[PDB]
């Protein structure tokens, strides 16, 4: 609903990866400082600079 590039990235952010957890839930993992997280980093965003 409401197709727009307001808050959409697609294949996760840069340096990140979608890995499947032992429970089945796909968590996020960054490759910049080797640090994963349960929450969604690509979702927590609503502002930028241009």
């Amino acid at each position: 609903g409401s197709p727009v590039d307001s808050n959409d990235l697609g294949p996760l952010p840069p340096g990140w990866e979608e890995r499947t957890h032992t429970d089945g839930r796909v968590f996020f993992i960054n490759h910049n400082i080797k640090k994963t997280q349960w929450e969604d980093p690509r979702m927590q965003n609503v502002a930028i600079t241009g």
């Binding site: 890995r19 968590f27 490759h31 080797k34 640090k35 997280q37």
Partner: peptide, 17 residues
């Protein structure tokens, strides 16, 4: 006897992956 669904610690570290 699990019960606890979310312990608190993040997923598997990249170093361990």
């Amino acid at each position: 006897g699990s019960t606890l669904p979310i312990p608190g610690t993040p997923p598997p570290n990249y170093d361990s992956l």
